[PDB]
Amino acid sequence: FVQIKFDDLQFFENCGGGSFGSVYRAKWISQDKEVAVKKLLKIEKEAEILSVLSHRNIIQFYGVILEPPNYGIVTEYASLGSLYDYINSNRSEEMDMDHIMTWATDVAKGMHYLHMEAPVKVIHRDLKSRNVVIAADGVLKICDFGASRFHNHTTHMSLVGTFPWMAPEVIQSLPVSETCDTYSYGVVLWEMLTREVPFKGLEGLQVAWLVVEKNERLTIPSSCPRSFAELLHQCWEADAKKRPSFKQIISILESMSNDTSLPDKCNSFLHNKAEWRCEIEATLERLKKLERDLSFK
Ligand SMILES: COc1n[nH]c2ncc(-c3cn(-c4c(F)ccc(NS(=O)(=O)c5cccc(Br)c5)c4F)nn3)cc12
Numbered sequence: 001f002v003q004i005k006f007d008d009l010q011f012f013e014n015c016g017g018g019s020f021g022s023v024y025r026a027k028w029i030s031q032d033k034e035v036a037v038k039k040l041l042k043i044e045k046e047a048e049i050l051s052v053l054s055h056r057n058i059i060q061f062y063g064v065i066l067e068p069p070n071y072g073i074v075t076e077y078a079s080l081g082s083l084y085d086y087i088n089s090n091r092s093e094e095m096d097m098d099h100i101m102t103w104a105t106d107v108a109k110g111m112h113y114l115h116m117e118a119p120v121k122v123i124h125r126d127l128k129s130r131n132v133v134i135a136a137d138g139v140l141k142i143c144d145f146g147a148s149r150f151h152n153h154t155t156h157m158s159l160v161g162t163f164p165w166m167a168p169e170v171i172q173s174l175p176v177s178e179t180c181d182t183y184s185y186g187v188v189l190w191e192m193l194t195r196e197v198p199f200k201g202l203e204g205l206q207v208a209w210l211v212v213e214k215n216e217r218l219t220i221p222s223s224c225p226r227s228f229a230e231l232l233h234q235c236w237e238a239d240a241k242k243r244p245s246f247k248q249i250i251s252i253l254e255s256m257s258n259d260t261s262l263p264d265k266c267n268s269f270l271h272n273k274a275e276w277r278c279e280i281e282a283t284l285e286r287l288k289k290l291e292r293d294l295s296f297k
Helices: 045-050 083-087 090-094 097-117 180-194 204-212 226-235 246-256 262-270 273-296
Strands: 009-014 023-028 033-040 061-067 070-076 132-134 140-142
Touching: 009 033, 033 061, 083 090, 083 132, 083 180, 097 140, 097 180, 097 246, 097 262, 180 226, 180 246, 180 273, 204 273, 226 246
Parallel strands: none
Antiparallel strands: 009 023, 023 033, 033 070, 061 070, 132 140
8 A cells, every 4th residue: 555645746637538537647756657646535445455456457556645635546647548539539440350359358358357356356337438548558457446336326417428338237226246347348349349439419318218128229230240249249138147257258259369250351340430330320310319209208
């Protein structure tokens, strides 16, 4: 439980962009290291117990600020920014199959560590693309895996903007197993495949209702390779007990990379978004038309 002095940190821009949160890029002066600093109301003993987690695909704890009124958690800083910003920028057009396979595996291995390999079982419950960051060598690291433990509850305000990634049982505040994270991982994979914002522009509670009540799921383009479509469908099962573990997802991804025909099929699909983005936009339009109907009641 390394202690860092508030004065040993030269601050920089908040990392959140839209809905900034309380995370800043900073320089740890005495260690000559670039860091992230999450400002906190107070440090609790949960920060101490999670401070020993270490895995290449989770953000690395460095220390805590323990100087009232300045509290915070310090971690490494991933040079290449958030997964969400990458996907929703022109840079992601460079992605091919190999890139996706490696990044799908990165997140799966981080979640496997959190679920099965840490001294304490961590269920994220808020896995999403904005909670994954890209280090300088391209290794993805999961962030914010302790937040669902720090706060014991939710409100509509804190859920706004996150409904597309939430498993139905999480939306419902029903019993929760670790495979709620499998559902969210499916959305992140879909984001990488389609390079779109899931359910873009839709009322969060319409998304919740569509996913929870109607078994609605994100549109998978018809030309998406069957191996990806099938894995998405497995991740998105309404019944959490039918979703695969992350150990199973890892073995599935590994087998897909022995498939000699998949790279051409996937690369052709990935680079053909001008042709199939209309399938995703058609469903958005239909759900927007559905929203107009459900406004008149
Ligand atoms: C442009 O935005 C970025 N570009 N590059 C980046 N690199 C990194 C980050 C980043 C780091 N964090 C961060 C943090 F500072 C402190 C804690 C957590 N997660 S946690 O669950 O509370 C946790 C983690 C480890 C030990 C414990 Br104990 C607790 C945390 F995620 N948040 N964002 C953002 C960017």
